Amino acid sequence: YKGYIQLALRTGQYKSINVIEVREGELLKWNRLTEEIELDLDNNTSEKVVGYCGYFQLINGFEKTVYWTRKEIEAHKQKFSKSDFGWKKDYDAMAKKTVLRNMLSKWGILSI
Amino acid sequence: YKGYIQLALRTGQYKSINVIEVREGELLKWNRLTEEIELDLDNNTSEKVVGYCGYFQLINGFEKTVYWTRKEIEAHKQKFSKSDFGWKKDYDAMAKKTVLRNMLSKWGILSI
Amino acid sequence: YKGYIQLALRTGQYKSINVIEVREGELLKWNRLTEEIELDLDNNTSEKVVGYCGYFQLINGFEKTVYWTRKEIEAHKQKFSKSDFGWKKDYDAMAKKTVLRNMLSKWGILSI
Amino acid sequence: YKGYIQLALRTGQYKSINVIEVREGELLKWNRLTEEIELDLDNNTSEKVVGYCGYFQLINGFEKTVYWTRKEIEAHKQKFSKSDFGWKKDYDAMAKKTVLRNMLSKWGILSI
Amino acid sequence: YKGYIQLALRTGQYKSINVIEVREGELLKWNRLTEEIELDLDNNTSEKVVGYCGYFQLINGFEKTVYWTRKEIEAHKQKFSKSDFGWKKDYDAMAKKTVLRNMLSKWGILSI
Amino acid sequence: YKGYIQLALRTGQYKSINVIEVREGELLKWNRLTEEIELDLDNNTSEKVVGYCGYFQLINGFEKTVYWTRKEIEAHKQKFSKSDFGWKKDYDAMAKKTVLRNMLSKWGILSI
Amino acid sequence: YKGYIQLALRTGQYKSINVIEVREGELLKWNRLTEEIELDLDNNTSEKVVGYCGYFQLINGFEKTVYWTRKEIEAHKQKFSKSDFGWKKDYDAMAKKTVLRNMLSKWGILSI
Amino acid sequence: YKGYIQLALRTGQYKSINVIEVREGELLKWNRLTEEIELDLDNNTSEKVVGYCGYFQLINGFEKTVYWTRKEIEAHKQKFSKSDFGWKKDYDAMAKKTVLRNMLSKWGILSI
């Protein structure tokens, strides 16, 4: 993936990129059609995360939002992944790296 | 198709683009004349997709919606497609790429 | 025609445009004076198209409907068209492109 | 005339406009006082047109009907028109353009 | 007068308006008290007009009829009009415009 | 008075209204009790008017007739009117407007 | 009283109503039993009114006549009326309005 | 009683109805068998009424006369009436209303 981030930095036409995790009872409602999402901070009771989100905006004003839950990531690990040694040590880091690599791959522009 | 996406990004006058899949018992009703579509989320029982949809809106306020079902895609694969090795591995990805290439081709503006 | 679509997009005062085909036993009744048309979906028995229709609405609320049958298109191809190589490969695409070019030409506004 | 259509489109308070030709044995009866007209379709025997008609309705519900025959148009061409090169090539297009320009002129509202 | 027509259109509570000319041997009998008028079409021999008429009906069902002859118009031109350059070019158009302006003025409702 | 006519039009329950002038040797006999009046047209010799009349009929069949002569109008101008600049320019128009305002006032129904 | 006239108009079953004043030396003889009254016009010498009369006839043929003199009206003003500011300005209008209100009240039919 | 008058008006087959009071030294002679009554007007000296009378005639020519004196009305008030507050304010109005109600009741035809 580090090659993908290297190419993204060498491209030099992006403005901002961010990936975060949304924990139980944090957001209000998400739309899968118009990409409408709203979130309220410091109002929560649990300590277990429920999903992941990512926001990427370019210098020309174009923006993109992606949101995933546990069902898709478990389906992906059970049909594509073939390693399990790192899954016991941590649960989120490899999920984040997969999210980044896919979002950079199928939408992101690459330059050499 | 990646050339088409490259040209679309280099054009730099679009605002948002999205392509999704609509699964059984998700939308309410679709109009083929006025492009009127409404969808209700998290209310569904099955696990088999039934159609595909796409929404593309420009920076000037112009928007366009496209919706396809299985009949048109199977007709297209039986009259135009000549390869079948990838159809057994996955069923949706190539359908999505065909949808994108056609929608970019016959409506989308291109620049060099 | 692609120049006409390019000029239409560069104009930037339209709201929605659509062109479709009406197949046998689909619509109910059409008025050629008040442009009154009503259509009932998923109630049909045949597989042969009978006409073409187009709806174009602007951002100011103005709308326009056009509907053509096979008689006018065959008269047009027999008095104006001088090529026949593409007519055997497909039957509808060039009819649609002629409909678009005429409707953009004699009503549509153009800007440079 | 194209300037008149441009001003009409830039006005942005109209709803629908249409101009057609009525051919022999098509309509039933026309009233010149109350603007009462009724027409029956697909019941005709000849192939020679006999008159022209136009219907224009605004967004506020106001509507207007105009109907002309060959006598008025021949009187107009013999007292006002000074050119004849285009009359041999076609017979109806310039009659339609005169109908549009007059109806837009003496009733239609114009804005700058 | 065009200002009067502009105000009438901007009012937006009228239904139909018409002004015509009645030529010799066209109508049957007219009543100046109950506004009873009846006319028979395509039964006439002369080619010289004898009077003018106007019918104006609102959206609420109210209707009004006005009919004038040559005596009143010649009295009006000889006591009020002060120009004669346009009278030789045409005879009816200015009579019609005076009829419209008076009927809009003394009965018609105006809004700003 | 124009406000009175505006209110009358906005009321929307009237059927017909008319005000005319009766000139010397025109009517036959008038009744002030049963409102019986009969008039014969195109049989007259003089050119000086002698009285004014008005007929107003509603949509429910109710009708009303009013007839005035010069004595009442001269008494009214000498006891109520305080202006004389317009009396020399014309003699009938202000008499008609007074007739309309009084008849609308003391019988006519008003709505807001 | 205007409410009484409003209710009378909204009733919509009357045919004609009239109230007049009879001046000295105008009528011939009046009967208080059979309501027989006869009057001769344009034969009079004085200029002082002596009484008031009213005729009201329905659509079904029923008619009613009422006639009053100065004695009854002065008795009524001295036993019922409590205001005198308007009596000096005019003498007849309030007498007429009292006649109308009483005749509408004790005979007239009212509807809501 | 107003209900009785309402029903009488809704019946719509009457022609004339009248009720009056006969004062001392007014009539000549009355017959209780053949209903023969004759009265001479404007020949009287007193100012105290002595009786009441009523005449009612239909559209078919049928007529009826009723005449009452003070003896019958005082007998009726002393055997039937149970209220006395209104008798001091006026003496005749309630007598008239009783006459009307009885005459409408025992002879008059009623319809619903």
Side-chain angles (χ1 to χ4, degrees), chain A residues 1-35 37-112, chain B residues 1-35 37-112, chain C residues 1-35 37-112, chain D residues 1-35 37-112, chain E residues 1-35 37-112, chain F residues 1-35 37-112, chain G residues 1-35 37-112, chain H residues 1-35 37-112:
Chain A
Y1 64 92
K2 79 204 167 293
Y4 288 102
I5 294 90
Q6 175 172 181
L7 295 175
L9 272 295
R10 257 76 173 276
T11 312
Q13 287 69 240
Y14 314 135
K15 194 260 185 180
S16 295
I17 185 169
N18 190 6
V19 298
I20 67 166
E21 51 199 332
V22 287
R23 186 269 302 279
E24 201 184 9
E26 182 65 26
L27 61 83
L28 283 72
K29 182 175 72 68
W30 179 67
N31 189 0
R32 68 180 65 252
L33 183 63
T34 62
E35 280 67 40
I37 179 67
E38 69 285 343
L39 187 152
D40 191 73
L41 55 89
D42 71 7
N43 189 359
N44 44 10
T45 187
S46 85
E47 286 311 305
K48 293 315 287 171
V49 73
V50 296
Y52 304 70
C53 183
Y55 182 76
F56 172 56
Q57 195 253 324
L58 283 72
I59 67 182
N60 63 7
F62 172 54
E63 77 272 20
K64 174 77 192 209
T65 62
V66 171
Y67 160 71
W68 271 29
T69 72
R70 305 235 194 178
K71 277 74 69 177
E72 38 266 36
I73 71 169
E74 63 86 20
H76 187 76
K77 67 169 70 69
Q78 76 187 122
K79 65 182 181 293
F80 182 76
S81 77
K82 62 204 53 163
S83 180
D84 211 26
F85 81 101
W87 284 100
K88 60 190 68 42
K89 184 129 61 173
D90 47 352
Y91 182 76
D92 63 358
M94 81 305 298
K96 308 261 298 166
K97 75 182 289 295
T98 61
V99 168
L100 275 296
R101 66 178 176 88
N102 292 48
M103 172 295 308
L104 289 174
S105 304
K106 189 171 76 70
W107 271 248
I109 190 167
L110 278 73
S111 175
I112 299 289
Chain B
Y1 64 92
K2 79 204 167 293
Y4 288 102
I5 294 90
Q6 175 172 181
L7 295 175
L9 272 295
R10 257 77 173 276
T11 312
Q13 287 69 240
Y14 314 135
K15 194 260 185 180
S16 295
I17 185 169
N18 190 6
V19 298
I20 66 166
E21 51 199 332
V22 287
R23 186 269 302 279
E24 201 184 9
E26 182 65 26
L27 61 83
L28 282 72
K29 182 175 72 68
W30 178 66
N31 189 0
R32 68 180 65 252
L33 183 63
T34 62
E35 280 67 40
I37 179 67
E38 69 285 343
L39 187 152
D40 191 73
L41 55 89
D42 71 7
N43 189 359
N44 44 10
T45 187
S46 85
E47 286 311 305
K48 293 315 287 171
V49 73
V50 296
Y52 304 70
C53 183
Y55 181 76
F56 172 56
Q57 195 253 324
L58 283 72
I59 66 182
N60 63 7
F62 172 54
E63 77 272 20
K64 174 77 192 209
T65 61
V66 171
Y67 160 71
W68 271 29
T69 72
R70 305 235 194 178
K71 277 74 69 177
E72 38 266 36
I73 71 169
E74 62 87 20
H76 187 76
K77 67 168 70 69
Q78 76 187 122
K79 65 182 181 293
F80 182 76
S81 77
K82 62 204 53 163
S83 180
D84 212 26
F85 81 100
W87 284 100
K88 60 190 68 42
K89 184 129 61 173
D90 47 352
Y91 182 76
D92 63 358
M94 81 305 298
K96 308 261 298 166
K97 75 182 289 295
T98 61
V99 168
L100 274 296
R101 66 178 176 88
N102 292 48
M103 172 295 308
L104 289 174
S105 304
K106 189 171 76 70
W107 271 248
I109 190 167
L110 278 73
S111 175
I112 299 289
Chain C
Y1 64 92
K2 79 204 167 293
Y4 288 102
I5 294 90
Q6 175 172 181
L7 294 175
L9 272 295
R10 257 77 173 276
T11 312
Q13 287 69 240
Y14 314 135
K15 194 260 185 180
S16 295
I17 185 169
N18 190 6
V19 298
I20 66 166
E21 51 199 332
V22 287
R23 186 269 302 279
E24 201 184 9
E26 182 65 26
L27 61 83
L28 283 72
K29 182 175 72 68
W30 178 67
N31 189 0
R32 68 180 65 252
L33 183 63
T34 62
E35 280 67 40
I37 179 67
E38 69 285 343
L39 187 152
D40 191 73
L41 55 89
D42 71 7
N43 189 359
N44 44 10
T45 187
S46 85
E47 286 312 305
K48 293 315 287 171
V49 73
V50 296
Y52 304 70
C53 183
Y55 182 76
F56 172 56
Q57 195 253 324
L58 283 72
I59 67 182
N60 64 7
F62 172 54
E63 77 272 20
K64 174 77 192 209
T65 61
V66 171
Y67 160 71
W68 271 29
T69 72
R70 305 235 194 179
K71 277 74 69 177
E72 38 266 36
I73 71 169
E74 62 87 20
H76 187 76
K77 67 168 70 69
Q78 76 187 122
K79 65 182 181 293
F80 182 76
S81 77
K82 62 204 53 163
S83 180
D84 211 26
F85 81 100
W87 284 100
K88 60 190 68 42
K89 184 129 61 173
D90 47 352
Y91 182 76
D92 63 358
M94 81 305 298
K96 308 261 298 166
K97 75 182 289 295
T98 61
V99 168
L100 274 296
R101 66 178 176 88
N102 292 48
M103 172 295 308
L104 289 174
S105 304
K106 189 171 76 70
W107 271 248
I109 190 167
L110 278 73
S111 175
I112 299 289
Chain D
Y1 64 92
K2 79 204 167 293
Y4 288 102
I5 294 90
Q6 175 172 181
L7 294 175
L9 272 295
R10 257 77 173 276
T11 312
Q13 287 70 240
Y14 314 135
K15 194 260 185 180
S16 295
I17 185 169
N18 190 6
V19 298
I20 67 166
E21 51 199 332
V22 287
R23 186 269 302 279
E24 201 184 9
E26 182 65 26
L27 61 83
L28 282 72
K29 182 175 72 68
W30 178 66
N31 189 0
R32 68 180 65 252
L33 183 62
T34 62
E35 280 67 40
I37 179 67
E38 69 285 343
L39 187 152
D40 191 73
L41 55 89
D42 71 7
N43 189 359
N44 44 10
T45 187
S46 85
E47 285 312 305
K48 293 315 287 171
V49 73
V50 296
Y52 303 70
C53 183
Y55 181 76
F56 172 56
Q57 195 253 324
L58 283 72
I59 67 182
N60 64 7
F62 172 54
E63 77 272 20
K64 174 77 192 209
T65 61
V66 170
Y67 160 71
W68 271 29
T69 72
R70 305 235 194 179
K71 277 74 69 177
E72 38 266 36
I73 72 169
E74 62 87 20
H76 187 76
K77 67 168 70 69
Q78 76 187 122
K79 65 182 181 293
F80 182 76
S81 77
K82 62 204 53 163
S83 180
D84 212 26
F85 81 101
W87 284 100
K88 60 190 68 42
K89 184 129 61 173
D90 47 352
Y91 182 76
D92 63 358
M94 81 305 298
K96 308 261 298 166
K97 75 182 289 295
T98 61
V99 168
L100 274 296
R101 66 178 176 88
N102 292 48
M103 172 295 308
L104 289 174
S105 304
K106 189 171 76 70
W107 271 248
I109 190 167
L110 278 73
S111 175
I112 299 289
Chain E
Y1 64 92
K2 79 204 167 293
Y4 288 102
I5 294 90
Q6 175 172 181
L7 295 175
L9 272 295
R10 257 76 173 276
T11 312
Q13 287 69 240
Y14 314 135
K15 194 260 185 180
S16 295
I17 185 169
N18 190 6
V19 298
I20 67 166
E21 51 199 332
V22 287
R23 186 269 302 279
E24 201 184 9
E26 182 65 26
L27 61 83
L28 282 72
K29 182 175 72 68
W30 178 67
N31 189 0
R32 68 180 65 252
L33 183 63
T34 62
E35 280 67 40
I37 179 67
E38 69 285 343
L39 187 152
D40 191 73
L41 55 89
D42 71 7
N43 189 359
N44 44 11
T45 187
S46 85
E47 286 312 305
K48 293 315 287 171
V49 73
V50 296
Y52 304 71
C53 183
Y55 181 76
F56 172 56
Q57 195 253 324
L58 283 72
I59 66 182
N60 63 7
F62 172 54
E63 77 272 20
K64 174 77 192 209
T65 61
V66 170
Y67 160 71
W68 271 29
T69 72
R70 305 235 194 178
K71 277 74 69 177
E72 38 266 36
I73 71 169
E74 62 87 20
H76 187 76
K77 67 168 70 69
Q78 76 187 122
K79 65 182 181 293
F80 182 76
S81 77
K82 62 204 53 163
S83 180
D84 212 26
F85 81 101
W87 284 100
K88 60 190 68 42
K89 184 129 61 173
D90 47 352
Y91 182 76
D92 63 358
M94 81 305 298
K96 308 261 298 166
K97 75 182 289 295
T98 61
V99 168
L100 274 296
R101 66 178 176 88
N102 292 48
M103 172 295 308
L104 289 174
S105 304
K106 189 171 76 70
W107 271 248
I109 190 167
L110 278 73
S111 175
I112 299 289
Chain F
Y1 64 92
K2 79 204 167 293
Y4 288 102
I5 294 90
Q6 175 172 181
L7 294 175
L9 272 295
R10 257 76 173 276
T11 312
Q13 287 69 240
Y14 314 135
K15 194 260 185 180
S16 295
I17 185 169
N18 190 6
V19 298
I20 66 166
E21 51 199 332
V22 287
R23 186 269 302 279
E24 201 184 9
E26 182 65 26
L27 61 83
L28 282 72
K29 182 175 72 68
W30 178 66
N31 189 0
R32 68 180 65 252
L33 183 63
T34 62
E35 280 67 40
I37 179 67
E38 69 285 343
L39 187 152
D40 191 73
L41 55 89
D42 71 7
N43 189 359
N44 44 10
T45 187
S46 85
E47 285 312 305
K48 293 315 287 171
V49 73
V50 296
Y52 304 70
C53 183
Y55 181 76
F56 172 56
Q57 195 253 324
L58 283 72
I59 67 182
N60 63 7
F62 172 54
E63 77 272 20
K64 174 77 192 209
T65 61
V66 171
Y67 160 71
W68 271 29
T69 72
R70 305 235 194 179
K71 277 74 69 177
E72 38 266 36
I73 72 169
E74 62 87 20
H76 187 76
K77 67 168 70 69
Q78 76 187 122
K79 65 182 181 293
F80 182 76
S81 77
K82 62 204 53 163
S83 180
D84 211 26
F85 81 101
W87 284 100
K88 60 190 68 42
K89 184 129 61 173
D90 47 352
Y91 182 76
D92 63 358
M94 81 305 298
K96 308 261 298 166
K97 75 182 289 295
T98 61
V99 168
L100 274 296
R101 66 178 176 88
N102 292 48
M103 172 295 308
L104 289 174
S105 304
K106 190 171 76 70
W107 271 248
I109 190 167
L110 278 73
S111 175
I112 299 289
Chain G
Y1 64 92
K2 79 204 167 293
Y4 288 102
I5 294 90
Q6 175 172 181
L7 295 175
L9 272 295
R10 257 76 173 276
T11 312
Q13 287 70 240
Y14 314 135
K15 194 260 185 180
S16 295
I17 185 169
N18 190 6
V19 298
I20 66 166
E21 51 199 332
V22 287
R23 186 269 302 279
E24 201 184 9
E26 182 65 26
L27 61 83
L28 283 72
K29 182 175 72 68
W30 179 66
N31 189 0
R32 68 180 65 252
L33 183 63
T34 62
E35 280 67 40
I37 179 67
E38 69 285 343
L39 187 152
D40 191 73
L41 55 89
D42 71 7
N43 189 359
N44 44 10
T45 187
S46 85
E47 286 312 305
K48 293 315 287 171
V49 73
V50 296
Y52 303 70
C53 183
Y55 181 76
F56 172 56
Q57 195 253 324
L58 283 72
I59 67 182
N60 64 7
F62 172 54
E63 77 272 20
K64 174 77 192 209
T65 61
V66 170
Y67 160 71
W68 271 29
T69 72
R70 305 235 194 179
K71 277 74 69 177
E72 38 266 36
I73 71 169
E74 62 87 20
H76 187 76
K77 67 168 70 69
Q78 76 187 122
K79 65 182 181 293
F80 182 76
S81 77
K82 62 204 53 163
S83 180
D84 212 26
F85 81 100
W87 284 100
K88 60 190 68 42
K89 184 129 61 173
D90 47 352
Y91 182 76
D92 63 358
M94 81 305 298
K96 308 261 298 166
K97 75 182 289 295
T98 61
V99 168
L100 274 296
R101 66 178 176 88
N102 292 48
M103 172 295 308
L104 289 174
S105 304
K106 190 171 76 70
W107 271 248
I109 190 167
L110 278 73
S111 175
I112 299 289
Chain H
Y1 64 92
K2 79 204 167 293
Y4 288 102
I5 294 90
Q6 175 172 181
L7 295 175
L9 272 295
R10 257 77 173 276
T11 312
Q13 287 69 240
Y14 314 135
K15 194 260 185 180
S16 295
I17 185 169
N18 190 6
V19 298
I20 66 166
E21 51 199 332
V22 287
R23 186 269 302 279
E24 201 184 9
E26 182 65 26
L27 61 83
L28 282 72
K29 182 175 72 68
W30 178 66
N31 189 0
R32 68 180 65 252
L33 183 63
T34 62
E35 280 67 40
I37 179 67
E38 69 285 343
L39 187 152
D40 191 73
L41 55 89
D42 71 7
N43 189 359
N44 44 10
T45 187
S46 85
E47 286 311 305
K48 293 315 287 171
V49 73
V50 296
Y52 304 70
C53 183
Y55 181 76
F56 172 56
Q57 195 253 324
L58 283 72
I59 66 182
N60 64 7
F62 172 54
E63 77 272 20
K64 174 77 192 209
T65 61
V66 171
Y67 160 71
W68 271 29
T69 72
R70 305 235 194 178
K71 277 74 69 177
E72 38 266 36
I73 71 169
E74 62 87 20
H76 187 76
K77 67 168 70 69
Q78 76 187 122
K79 65 182 181 293
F80 182 76
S81 77
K82 62 204 53 163
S83 180
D84 212 26
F85 81 101
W87 284 100
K88 60 190 68 42
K89 184 129 61 173
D90 47 352
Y91 182 76
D92 63 358
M94 81 305 298
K96 308 261 298 166
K97 75 182 289 295
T98 61
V99 168
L100 274 296
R101 66 178 176 88
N102 292 48
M103 172 295 308
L104 289 174
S105 304
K106 190 171 76 70
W107 271 248
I109 190 167
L110 278 73
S111 175
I112 299 289

